[PDB]
């Protein structure tokens, strides 16, 4: 597309109990990280790497409109499997989804958003390395990935 | 003769004289890289 | 190449042009903030991307016991005879057979390729 | 001089109880927080949930100044404790346990797009023109 | 017991660090959870290996993996991991005598 | 599984809260297992040997018991806490 | 001047404080009495181009704790307190971070093992029952 190939390749997230995926940056907005620098700090640990910074540009533009945590939570709640009757209930549902359903192994406590942002950023960071070719793709057959 | 081969591109003068003067180059740059056939 | 962040809301700064002065300006979005651009390059991509692997190589790899070690390539920085050699083995290269050497002397993470 | 070999030793005191609790306030380095302009500030519990188990809201210089939100550290220090040493005239260090750890980040102030407004932009999210212009119209 | 020991040693919790410090340090993962970062990965692995071999805090079935290139230490304690006994070799010699 | 997982599963289960307004709570704490037992027609328990299970087409199963504590509140500033040991 | 106002006087004086990470046993011993007004002495030794921090445990308390400093330029830390009379104040700004480590290495794990075992007491396990419940 004209503008489709200009921004590049954008990253989305398929969170549980959501019918349709959401932009990755939106999930960071919901977790409480609003500014781009705060979000990118959890994804790119070395700002001196121009290659990594470009990979996240299309993702930032996709979620440019959403600029507040409550706005982001409503967007996540709006796409929930059981959309809320009102906007306030949508935010509560989205908060519950991220609180327990998203990355539960990281934590389920009400104050684990920071830990979930780091791991989610690590998931994005790992994806960028695969996209950049810096790290080899995981092997399903590798038996240390099995239980 | 120069060790580096270069090709400078700029938008038409008539349009300069609607989408975006900056983003449009990226659309052209991406479009020319793949869609254009040499 | 340089990525700039707003000084008010710590958001991304995108390039913008002021017709009044005809000088590149990095203007924050949703922040009515502007900055004086100096690089003059807003976007650059290298299709060949001949990015040096030595920059990517981490000196800690010299502690890997699974890497081969050669005494025939002494370190230039310190002269340590022992060195640990390996291949990049990273995608986008299409030809990964050259060896990169890392000095095994502690505190000397010198990296070189022959 | 004496500073080249100065040795200082002070007594450590641990009062059983204090009227005021001690907690850590953390600011990110990139925030460039400066207290010179902090003429006035307000710290209170949030009202979004609508108390002791809710986030803390920090406001500086009223609405004009920057606003920060503090969140309790989810990770508990079951195997760790934190103490702060404060200089006193008696010359003996005093250590107070950290009741809580709070992380504060700045909150940007501007005409942020509302939830209803974001719905319209969702139509053009895939295809949008002149990202700068979207804020100007609002 | 692994997390308690890691906190005692020079491992900084994720909450109590600035993101600028994560670049040089190695991420510490326990059962897939990024517990924190550590500035001396080599010494930690030697200490972690020593404890497991002495069976002090780390049980025999706990596997510690250091990805030197990726600057990551992965500690796995969950079930379902297939392992086998191997003789330890130090300085090109068997510890079995 | 028997020594840890079963007990953890019972412990991790949320307490049962019921409202009528009298309020009822059920909390399960301790798990007990008896040796594999078989009950005769008369109802007399007896240890079940694996060969007898094989011969008589029985299931080699051990009875499972759980200590249940029940607390009831009847908005009368009184609380009654009754525990059923080895349910 | 209001209830929510923060007494930022401590920030004005630029008072410096030290953040120290210590294990539980050291604090647990302090928590034992916690009212004698004394738990030990903090000794700091400085040389021409090196500084070392160490702490000594009180003899009565027992019946060496070397300290390692950490960089504080990567994060700015401040200390504030909330008064019971609803009067918040800022004690000061953290200027240095330190951590406490155990002098012993082998027998120290023995104390840790006891703590791990002690914290395992609430860990309930299924109990074999000799006689079927009747
Ligand atoms: Zn801005
Ligand atoms: Zn060398």
TrEMBL record, chain A:
<feature type="domain" description="RNA polymerase Rpb2">
    <location>
        <begin position="1"/>
        <end position="147"/>
    </location>
</feature>
<comment type="similarity">
    <text>Belongs to the RNA polymerase beta chain family.</text>
</comment>
<comment type="function">
    <text>DNA-dependent RNA polymerase catalyzes the transcription of DNA into RNA using the four ribonucleoside triphosphates as substrates.</text>
</comment>
<protein>
    <recommendedName>
        <fullName>DNA-directed RNA polymerase subunit beta</fullName>
    </recommendedName>
</protein>
<comment type="function">
    <text>RNA-dependent RNA polymerase that catalyzes the extension of a non-coding RNA (ncRNA) at the 3'-end using the four ribonucleoside triphosphates as substrates. An internal ncRNA sequence near the 3'-end serves as a template in a single-round Pol II-mediated RNA polymerization reaction. May decrease the stability of ncRNAs that repress Pol II-mediated gene transcription.</text>
</comment>
Automatic annotation (TrEMBL), chain E:
<comment type="function">
    <text>DNA-dependent RNA polymerase catalyzes the transcription of DNA into RNA using the four ribonucleoside triphosphates as substrates.</text>
</comment>
<feature type="domain" description="RNA polymerase Rpb2">
    <location>
        <begin position="28"/>
        <end position="90"/>
    </location>
</feature>
<comment type="function">
    <text>RNA-dependent RNA polymerase that catalyzes the extension of a non-coding RNA (ncRNA) at the 3'-end using the four ribonucleoside triphosphates as substrates. An internal ncRNA sequence near the 3'-end serves as a template in a single-round Pol II-mediated RNA polymerization reaction. May decrease the stability of ncRNAs that repress Pol II-mediated gene transcription.</text>
</comment>
<comment type="similarity">
    <text>Belongs to the RNA polymerase beta chain family.</text>
</comment>
<protein>
    <recommendedName>
        <fullName>DNA-directed RNA polymerase subunit beta</fullName>
    </recommendedName>
</protein>
UniProtKB/TrEMBL annotation, chain F:
<protein>
    <recommendedName>
        <fullName>DNA-directed RNA polymerase subunit beta</fullName>
    </recommendedName>
</protein>
<comment type="similarity">
    <text>Belongs to the RNA polymerase beta chain family.</text>
</comment>
<comment type="function">
    <text>DNA-dependent RNA polymerase catalyzes the transcription of DNA into RNA using the four ribonucleoside triphosphates as substrates.</text>
</comment>
<comment type="function">
    <text>RNA-dependent RNA polymerase that catalyzes the extension of a non-coding RNA (ncRNA) at the 3'-end using the four ribonucleoside triphosphates as substrates. An internal ncRNA sequence near the 3'-end serves as a template in a single-round Pol II-mediated RNA polymerization reaction. May decrease the stability of ncRNAs that repress Pol II-mediated gene transcription.</text>
</comment>
């Amino acid at each position: 597309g004209a503008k489709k190939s200009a921004i590049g390749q954008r990253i989305v997230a398929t969170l549980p109990y959501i019918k349709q995926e959401v932009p990755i940056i939106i999930v960071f907005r919901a977790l409480g990280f609003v500014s781009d620098r705060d979000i990118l700090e959890h994804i790119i640990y070395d700002f001196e790497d121009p290659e990594m910074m470009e990979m996240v540009k299309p993702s930032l533009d996709e979620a440019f409109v959403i600029q507040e945590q409550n706005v982001a939570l409503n967007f996540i709640g709006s796409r929930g499997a059981k959309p809320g009757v009102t906007k306030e209930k949508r935010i509560k549902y989205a908060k519950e989804v991220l609180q327990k359903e998203m990355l539960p192994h990281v934590g389920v406590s009400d104050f684990c958003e920071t830990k979930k942002a780091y791991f989610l950023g690590y998931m994005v960071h790992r994806l960028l390395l695969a996209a950049l070719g810096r790290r080899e793709l995981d092997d399903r057959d590798h038996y240390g990935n099995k239980r | 003769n120069a060790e580096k081969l270069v090709l400078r591109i700029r938008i038409m003068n008539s349009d300069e004289n609607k989408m975006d003067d900056d983003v449009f180059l990226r659309c052209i740059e991406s479009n020319m890289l793949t869609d254009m056939t040499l | 190449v340089g990525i700039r962040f707003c000084q008010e809301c710590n958001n991304m700064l995108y390039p913008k042009e002021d017709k009044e002065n005809r000088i590149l300006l990095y203007a924050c979005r949703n922040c009515d903030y502007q900055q004086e651009a100096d690089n003059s390059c807003i976007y650059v991509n290298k299709i060949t991307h001949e990015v040096d692997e030595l920059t990517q190589i981490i000196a800690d790899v010299s502690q890997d016991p699974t890497l081969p070690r050669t005494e025939d390539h002494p370190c230039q920085k310190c002269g340590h005879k022992e060195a640990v050699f390996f291949q990049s083995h990273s995608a986008r290269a299409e030809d990964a057979m050259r060896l990169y050497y890392v000095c095994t002397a502690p505190h000397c993470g010198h990296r070189w390729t022959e | 001089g004496p500073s080249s070999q100065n040795v200082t030793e002070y007594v450590v005191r641990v009062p059983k109880n204090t009227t005021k609790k001690y907690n850590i306030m953390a600011f990110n380095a990139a925030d460039k927080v400066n207290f010179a302009t902090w003429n006035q500030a307000r710290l209170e519990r949030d009202l979004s949930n609508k108390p002791e188990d809710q986030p803390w809201l920090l406001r500086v210089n009223g609405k004009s100044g920057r606003k920060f939100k503090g969140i309790k550290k989810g990770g508990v220090t079951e195997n760790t404790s934190y103490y702060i040493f404060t200089q006193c005239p008696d010359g003996a260090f005093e250590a107070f346990p950290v009741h809580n750890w709070y992380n504060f980040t700045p909150l940007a102030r501007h005409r942020t797009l509302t939830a209803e407004e974001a719905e319209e932009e969702w139509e053009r999210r895939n295809k949008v023109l002149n990202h700068f212009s979207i804020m100007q119209q609002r | 017991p692994i997390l308690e020991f890691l906190e005692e040693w020079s491992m900084e919790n994720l909450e109590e660090i600035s993101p600028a410090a994560i670049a040089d340090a190695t991420k510490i993962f326990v059962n897939g959870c990024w517990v924190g970062i550590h500035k001396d990965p080599e010494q930690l692995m030697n200490t972690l290996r020593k404890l497991r071999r002495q069976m002090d805090i780390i049980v025999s079935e706990v596997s510690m993996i250091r990805d030197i290139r990726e600057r990551e230490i992965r500690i796995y304690t969950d079930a379902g991991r297939i392992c086998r006994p191997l003789l330890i070799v130090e300085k090109q010699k068997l510890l079995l005598k | 599984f028997i020594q840890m997982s079963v007990q953890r599963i019972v412990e991790d289960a949320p307490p049962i809260d019921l409202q009528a307004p009298p309020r009822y709570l059920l909390k399960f704490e301790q798990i007990y297992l008896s040796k594999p037992t078989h009950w005769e027609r008369d109802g007399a328990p007896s240890p079940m040997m694996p060969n007898e299970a094989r011969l008589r087409n029985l299931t080699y199963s051990a009875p499972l018991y759980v200590d249940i504590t029940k607390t009831v509140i009847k908005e009368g500033e009184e609380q009654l806490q009754t525990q059923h040991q080895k349910t | 001047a209001e209830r929510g106002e923060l007494d930022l006087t401590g920030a004005k004086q630029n008072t410096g404080v030290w953040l120290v990470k210590v294990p539980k046993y050291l604090s647990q011993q302090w928590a034992k009495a916690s009212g004698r007004g004394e738990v030990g002495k903090l000794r700091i030794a400085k040389t021409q181009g090196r500084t070392e921090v160490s702490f000594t445990l009180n003899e009565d308390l027992a019946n060496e704790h070397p300290f390692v400093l950490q960089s504080v330029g990567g994060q700015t830390l401040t200390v504030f307190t909330e008064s019971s009379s609803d009067k918040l104040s800022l004690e000061g700004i953290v200027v240095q971070r330190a951590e406490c480590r155990p002098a012993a290495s082998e027998n120290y794990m023995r104390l840790k093992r006891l703590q791990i075992e002690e914290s395992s007491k609430p860990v309930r396990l299924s109990q074999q029952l000799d006689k079927v419940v009747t």
